[PDB]
Amino acid sequence: TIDGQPLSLSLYATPADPSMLLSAAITASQGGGDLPHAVMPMYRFPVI
Amino acid sequence: LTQLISFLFQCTQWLTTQKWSVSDVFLMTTDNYSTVLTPDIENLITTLS
């Protein structure tokens, strides 16, 4: 203008959106235990 | 074509009503899963075995 001020206004672009925070419950695997060696007792079945 | 437009509209409104993304229904629906064997699958194997 006569003072040096613009006629066509400036751009005001859209800022970045707030994101959604993400996590994860990652999982592992330990196997089952190997069954041991059986030992014959000296007592009968009700006692042992 | 107008049937496919109507389908896309009712599916999109269904998605935004349920607050699900397209990735959600894709995870719930697809056949393009990966075939790698996951510790979740392994836990299912040994638990149910």
Side-chain angles (χ1 to χ4, degrees), chain B residues 32-46:
Chain B
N32 293 318
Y33 48 79
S34 74
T35 184
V36 70
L37 178 136
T38 301
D40 284 325
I41 297 168
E42 292 177 353
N43 290 325
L44 198 145
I45 294 163
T46 177

Side-chain angles (χ1 to χ4, degrees), chain B residues 11-28:
Chain B
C11 180
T12 298
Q13 294 295 319
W14 174 64
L15 284 171
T16 191
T17 302
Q18 275 167 336
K19 295 181 182 179
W20 295 351
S21 67
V22 180
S23 178
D24 294 331
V25 170
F26 183 75
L27 211 156
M28 292 164 68

Side-chain angles (χ1 to χ4, degrees), chain A residues 2-17:
Chain A
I2 185 68
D3 294 331
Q5 294 181 357
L7 295 174
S8 180
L9 55 91
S10 178
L11 181 65
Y12 295 99
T14 301
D17 53 352

Side-chain angles (χ1 to χ4, degrees), chain A residues 14-46:
Chain A
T14 301
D17 53 352
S19 178
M20 184 176 176
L21 275 72
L22 294 173
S23 295
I26 60 170
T27 181
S29 291
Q30 295 184 359
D34 290 330
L35 193 65
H37 181 72
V39 176
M40 183 67 203
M42 285 302 295
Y43 295 98
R44 283 176 175 85
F45 182 73

